[PDB]
């Protein structure tokens, strides 16, 4: 009863709900963001979730396992494999910075453990004065530069914690999971859920001289009529839905290749998606934003969110723990939990690449894991040391990449494979039938909507995207394009090796 409940609640908590979402909403004028977000959830998130479960199960029934191959099975065209490459590129690229963020959560957990945490400036009552110590904790941790300097200078502790995080991730990927998987996740997910609920409830009673936590909830759920005409918000919102639902990643597809063709995917898929939404908009969205506005004020919360991706909670949360009962211990627990939550997700975003190396190109587990780990570890130095690089990757892979790729999966699965064949595939084994209207949404509304969104988005933000020289971001654009070309090269090598016999 209670156990089954807390167990059901723990399945969806990702860093996407806590660290990422607050930053996405704040950078976009919260609530002006919520409308497109909710609309995207109903018109894009749910249908694609169902689509991914169907495609994954279908591909498992066959045995491809990766999007390049499943796409090839659905559409026999060399071009299908290339569009399919996004199913490896997106998760790999997200893994590159995602592992670093996880390392920040471990570092913070450690610092809270030792009681080395930021306390507000006594008797200062100045929102900027109040914000500087908390800003400094994160900034001193990752080593933010003064004056938009290209080079970032992370503290030694952060780097060592990164090394440890990689060692732990690799150590896990090589050997299976027995002592730290079910036995620990079954404790941490319910614990984290309970803790998060505690925090939402606690933060909402918070009211201070610089603002009120209530004002934060009002700020987040009050539509800004003005920002709706902004493509960036629509793209950001859809991108977040994709990220938070794990939807846009080839990981859900591969994981889904393990459930039987006759097993229901309609109720199960809808349940996972709905549970995920209730899991963030209510808990993650109701903690960090209200806390920052109550504490730092609106202007500072937005400025902090706009500072970079994931920054917001690393500041707002520690600020919150202060002035709270057993806040240092509560903080340690929160960040350690968060750390495990991140880990669970990173091995999952590495699984598409590992699986690709094993099924195609016929590589062992050791080699797939070691080469994948080598790529994330080496590449991550770009995100830890190059200013604005992390943000750029989080943008291209976790925001833009996923929506375009989502559209690709919808066209490939529904249009090319079969309107009705696709519907039939989704429908088999369902506990309930798919609502009649979604056939029409998926076939006409969702794809037209997304295509239009990307087009309107481009040429609004493209020229602005060509107008940005930080000297450190062009390295990242060139580099990630190179990585994409490299993966295309791996798919080419797989077909050459097969055709050679």
């Amino acid at each position, epitope marked *: 009863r209670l156990g089954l409940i807390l167990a059901m609640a723990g399945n969806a908590v990702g860093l996407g709900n806590f660290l990422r979402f607050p930053v996405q909403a704040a950078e976009n004028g919260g609530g002006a963001f919520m409308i497109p977000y909710i609309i995207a959830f109903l018109l894009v998130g749910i249908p694609l979730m169902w689509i991914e479960w169907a495609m994954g199960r279908y591909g498992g029934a066959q045995g491809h396992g990766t999007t390049p191959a499943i796409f090839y099975l659905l559409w026999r065209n060399r071009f299908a494999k290339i569009l399919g490459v996004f199913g490896l590129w997106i998760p790999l690229v997200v893994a590159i910075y995602y592992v670093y963020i996880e390392s920040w959560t471990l570092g913070f957990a450690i610092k809270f453990l030792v009681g080395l945490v930021p306390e507000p400036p006594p008797n200062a009552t100045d929102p900027d004065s109040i914000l500087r110590p908390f800003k400094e904790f994160l900034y001193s941790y990752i080593g933010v530069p003064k004056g938009d300097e290209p080079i970032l200078k992370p503290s030694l502790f952060a780097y060592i914690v990164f090394l440890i995080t990689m060692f732990i991730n690799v150590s896990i990927l090589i050997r299976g999971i027995s002592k730290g998987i079910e036995r620990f996740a079954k404790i941490a997910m319910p614990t984290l859920f309970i803790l998060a609920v505690f925090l939402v409830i606690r933060v909402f009673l918070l009211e201070t001289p610089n603002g009120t936590a209530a004002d934060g909830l009002n700020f987040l759920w009050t539509p800004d009529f003005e920002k709706l005409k902004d493509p960036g918000v629509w793209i950001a919102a859809v991108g977040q839905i994709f990220f938070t639902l794990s939807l846009g990643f080839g990981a859900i597809i591969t994981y889904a290749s*393990a*459930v039987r063709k006759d097993q229901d995917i309609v109720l199960s898929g809808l349940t996972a998606a709905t549970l995920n939404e209730a899991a963030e908009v209510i808990l993650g969205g109701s903690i960090s934003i209200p806390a920052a506005v109550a504490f730092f004020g609106v202007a500072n919360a937005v400025a902090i969110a706009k500072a970079g991706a994931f920054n917001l909670g690393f500041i707002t949360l520690p600020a919150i723990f202060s002035q709270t009962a057993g806040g240092t211990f509560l903080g340690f627990l929160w960040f350690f939990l968060l750390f495990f939550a991140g880990l669970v997700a990173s091995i999952a975003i590495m699984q598409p690449m590992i699986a690709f190396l094993e099924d195609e190109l016929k590589l062992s587990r050791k080699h797939a894991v070691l080469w994948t780990a080598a790529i994330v570890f080496f590449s991550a130095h770009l995100v830890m040391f190059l200013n604005k690089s992390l943000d750029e990757m989080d943008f291209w892979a976790g925001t833009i990449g996923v929506v375009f790729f989502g559209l690709t999966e919808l066209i490939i699965f529904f249009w090319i494979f079969g309107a009705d064949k696709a519907w039939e595939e989704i429908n088999r084994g369902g506990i309930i039938k798919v609502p009649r209207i979604y056939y029409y949404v998926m076939r006409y509304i969702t794809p037209a909507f997304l295509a239009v969104l990307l087009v309107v988005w481009a040429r609004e933000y493209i020229p602005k995207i060509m107008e940005e020289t930080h000297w450190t971001v062009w390295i990242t654009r060139f580099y990630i394009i190179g990585l994409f070309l490299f993966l295309t090269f791996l798919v080419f090598l797989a077909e050459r090796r097969r055709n050679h016999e």
Partner: antibody
Amino acid sequence: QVQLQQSGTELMRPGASVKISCKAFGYTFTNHHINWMKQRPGQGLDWIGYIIPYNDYTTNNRKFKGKATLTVDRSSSTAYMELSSLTSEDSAVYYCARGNYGAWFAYWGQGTLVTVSA
Amino acid sequence: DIVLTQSPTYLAVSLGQRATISCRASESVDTYDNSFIHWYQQKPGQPPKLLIYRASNLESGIPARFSGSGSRTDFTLTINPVETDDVATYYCQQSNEDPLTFGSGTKLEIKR
């Protein structure tokens, strides 16, 4: 580069129980269904039943329903088949084979021999 | 269940000539216009060995000598030209309906 390695030959008194371990190497174990099949030396292959390594969740063919229990150790990347209520007719060669994600049965085990006699 | 009946149980053929083994099914093996019958080469002392999948498709590592054919119920495994090491029992399988079922096997022997 995938290898499936099976315990070996075993002798048992009729009515007893045995547990055969098919150990999986060189691939991500959770990604792929593992199938269990029975073959007499002079007979065609009967499918015993499969198991989904990620979620467990075995399915046995009607014929073998009570005589075969399929389990898995995810830590050691191993699949297990336990045969109970042994009889001479249970004496045969047993194969574990994983099709990719479950085409079927692309990679085969070396096989395991069971002799039921006193 | 779906029962697979294989034509000649024992087949003997001279070197360089073609061998045609057949497979018949009680129900259609086709779902979504795809034939789910699969062929296996098993030598004594060995496990089976996958030859052809989805009935028309040549598995890797297997020489082009092995070709799949047929549809609906009837299926045809064609080995031309037959080679010496191709002596073994050959099986067919149907994955379309669960559970899965196998043919009784066809033992090939060369005429020397």
